[PDB]
Design a protein around this ligand. Structure first.
Ligand SMILES: CC(=O)N[C@@H]1[C@@H](O[C@@H]2O[C@H](CO)[C@H](O)[C@H](O)[C@H]2O)[C@@H](O)[C@@H](CO)O[C@@H]1O
Ligand SMILES: CC(=O)N[C@@H]1[C@@H](O[C@@H]2O[C@H](CO)[C@H](O)[C@H](O)[C@H]2O)[C@@H](O)[C@@H](CO)O[C@@H]1O
Ligand SMILES: CC(=O)N[C@@H]1[C@@H](O[C@@H]2O[C@H](CO)[C@H](O)[C@H](O)[C@H]2O)[C@@H](O)[C@@H](CO)O[C@@H]1O
Ligand SMILES: CC(=O)N[C@@H]1[C@@H](O[C@@H]2O[C@H](CO)[C@H](O)[C@H](O)[C@H]2O)[C@@H](O)[C@@H](CO)O[C@@H]1O
Lengths: 142, 142, 142, 142
């Protein structure tokens, strides 16, 4: 199995304050489960080849998704911003598979990704433990 | 908009103890969001015609999903038990739409549903506020 | 160290739904901390001879406290019901020490305790692991 | 009633990640309760003249407390760092009253306070709504 444990850092009150509004797990690799402990979020997966998505909403209405997973035994991540209300995590997570429009991002196996949204919010995912089965990453909103 | 607020009642320690491992929102009706407050869980939706699923896992390994939504201006619900690890909420939620195998259950517009699983766990969903836009239901594991 | 992990079972929607409104840790035995994981609550203490209290409020307005700790290397518990708003856990926890009015209950070192409040709500604390340093109990509201 | 709603911002992963390990409510002004909603924390009090404390622990072992309250109809705040394990929030909260050693900080009725701990962690409490009965503050760790 693989696990990915996320710590969420929100840096800048001017961007508003984000909370989780959805959590999905893709069905490959015998699926997986999200759990929470001590304010952290862990995705546990049945092997290499699947992923999960957290969707966040800010108190200013901004919607963004963070995807993490393991592809061919290496971690990957992506952040999608500027989402419409109908673009739920249930819509987004499958887009990384079955030759969907985001598959290329999964294939990159990124240990770090940075993107800034249409309303100016800075997002970074950065793995702090980048190899092995017990992976760790910081999700930073700025 | 419609909201459905759930209170989870776990009755019987012999069944183990369940926690939420996934939360999905279907993309119809401009989507929606899950939120938590005072130990309760609220699905807020952009109109009639969509839904969301909570997947639960017990500390004895049992996996079950609870689906709630609004179909043609009336609440509906379903509970699916005996799930395999690969049958995530991401798999289950869409099965209520696009002529999927669970669409019939949504169409019933049930205000109450009772089912007992293969390992003997009793599940009930019961709406306590059954009409209007601010719906309320108890989810009982027994 | 000693830890006590609690699982909260709520049986009867007629009593309303309870959530935690305060958590205290008494200062003996190098204190301790509350943490949450997978819907469970763990009090971790620096040794035998201290305790902590969760105060709960129901959505029907009922206030009650659950105390757990270790006294002379054996677990103990208590439940206090019918609290007034000013009787916070900060008031209650110290009453088990310094010859306070609740010390007698700590001294009993109970592995189980049952009480019914004046409004008819049944409360039970029952330890399912009653010996050693990694203690476990169910807290049952009914 | 007075309420104080807190949003917690953590800026700098180098300081580690903090989670709440205790929440107290002082017994004056008919007490009060802590609640959580959408990742925010609200202290609801029966009137002016009381307070509550959140104690946080980082995953690097640092212990700190944040006190908020209303004194003579104006908000107040304080932060105490470098705590030993036995200095729980149960010890700290009462120190703001009965001519205790921290009363002077309550009496200042501060809308903002900044402190850096001996290990280099910056803490700020800043009220964003500083008047009326529905007060709001950001708690920033850096
Ligand atoms: C080893 C690995 O990461 N493989 C990835 C695939 O994962 C496998 O997918 C199959 C279903 O096709 C099955 O669920 C396996 O258990 C799982 O390991 C899959 O994610 C593909 C997607 O393009 O990438 C890798 O091949
Ligand atoms: C009024 C209502 O509940 N209608 C249901 C449909 O919901 C609509 O679906 C469309 C997309 O087809 C769109 O998203 C609308 O905003 C939404 O109201 C849909 O759920 C169907 C599924 O069979 O049932 C009703 O017709
Ligand atoms: C071993 C044990 O449980 N002792 C209990 C006491 O606990 C000790 O208390 C002292 C403070 O007086 C100190 O904090 C120690 O670290 C702690 O172990 C205490 O709880 C008394 C209360 O009457 O009961 C036992 O003796
Ligand atoms: C109006 C106000 O904020 N008064 C503060 C006091 O609060 C009152 O305290 C008494 C108990 O002595 C009682 O609990 C009241 O209900 C409460 O309003 C108290 O906090 C003092 C502490 O020095 O400060 C103000 O006077």
């Amino acid at each position: 199995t693989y696990s990915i444990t996320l710590r969420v850092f929100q840096r800048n009150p001017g961007r508003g304050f984000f909370s989780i509004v959805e959590k999905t797990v893709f069905h490959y690799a015998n699926g997986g489960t999200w759990s929470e402990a001590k304010g952290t979020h862990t995705l546990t997966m049945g092997g290499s080849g699947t992923s999960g998505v957290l969707r966040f909403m800010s108190d200013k209405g901004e919607l963004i998704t963070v995807a993490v997973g393991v592809h061919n035994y290496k971690r990957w991540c992506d952040v999608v911003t500027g989402l419409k209300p109908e673009e739920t995590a249930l819509v987004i997570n499958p887009q990384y598979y079955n030759n969907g429009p985001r598959a290329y991002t999964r294939e990159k196996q990124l240990a770090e990704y940075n993107v800034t949204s249409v309303v100016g919010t800075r997002f970074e995912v950065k793995y702090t433990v980048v190899e092995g089965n017990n992976l760790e990453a910081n999700v930073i909103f700025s």
